[PDB]
């Protein structure tokens, strides 16, 4: 039977009109339908290490030249606590995109969620 589908979990960030990654761009995630760059509207972010450590970082997320988020020169996976609104800005400072309500659930760590949820 099939239990796990091979896929990559690394997000890619591209432009809005062309097929090229937003190089050295910045991401702000804040509350839904708001202005993310304002520090009042932002929400906490966490690098999910391989062992699920959930280590928090600052808000402006830096994008590589390939579109993948980086931190300290290494690719990271970034998670949030709630549905958010995203503002993606280019290296120059132009607004690549703004989205009011985006929500995607973590596909991993089903064991802990099932542990909590299902009955012993």
């Amino acid at each position: 039977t099939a239990n796990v589908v091979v896929s990559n979990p690394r997000p890619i960030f591209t432009e809005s009109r062309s097929f090229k990654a937003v190089a050295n761009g910045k991401i702000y995630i804040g509350q839904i339908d708001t202005d993310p760059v304002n520090p009042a509207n932002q929400i906490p972010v966490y690098i999910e290490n391989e062992d699920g450590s959930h280590v928090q970082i600052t808000q402006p997320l830096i994008i590589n030249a390939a579109g993948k988020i980086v931190y300290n020169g290494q690719l990271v996976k970034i998670v949030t606590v709630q549905g958010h609104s995203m503002a993606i800005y280019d290296a120059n400072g132009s607004q690549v995109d703004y989205i009011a309500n985006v929500l995607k659930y973590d596909p991993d760590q089903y064991s802990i969620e099932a542990d909590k949820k299902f009955k012993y």
Binding site: A91, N92, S94
Partner: protein, 152 residues
């Protein structure tokens, strides 16, 4: 000269156009800054025809450098006015404006002055043809049997 970066050239061009200056209480939009930087790169690449056009010293950015703005343009102290006036003229049609006749005249004058020294340097005379004698008055270029000019 406080104009030292491609961003500085773009800002001067936009101010000259009146689109974004501190004398009109308007601020430069980053989306227009990137567009004007692209326009400047294309314009200087068209001028400097791969070593056979207007020589300016302008340095062309490489792709491994992500942000083009903020880089020194490398131009000499005297090409700045020509470069940014021509840039203003080129990027005016994006905003459905027309650069004023003063800007056009300054752009023409600047381009001419830009090519002047290269024109003087390239205005070289050809060597003597290989079928043209050296004469006998040239004693040294004879008695070595150099009766005819080398050519090429």
């Amino acid at each position: 000269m406080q104009i030292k970066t491609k961003g500085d050239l773009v800002r001067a061009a936009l101010r000259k156009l009146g689109v974004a200056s501190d004398a009109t209480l308007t601020d430069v939009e980053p989306q227009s800054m990137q567009d004007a930087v692209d326009d400047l790169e294309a314009m200087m690449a068209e001028w400097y025809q791969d070593g056979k056009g207007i020589i300016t010293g302008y340095v062309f950015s490489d792709d491994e450098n992500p942000p083009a703005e903020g880089d020194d343009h490398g131009l000499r102290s005297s090409a700045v006015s020509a470069v940014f006036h021509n840039l203003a003229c080129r990027i005016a049609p994006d905003y459905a404006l027309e650069a004023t006749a003063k800007i056009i005249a300054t752009a023409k004058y600047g381009k001419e002055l830009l090519y002047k020294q290269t024109a003087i340097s390239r205005a070289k005379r050809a060597p003597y043809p290989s079928r043209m004698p050296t004469g006998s008055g040239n004693s040294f270029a004879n008695l070595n049997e150099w009766h005819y000019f080398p050519g090429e």
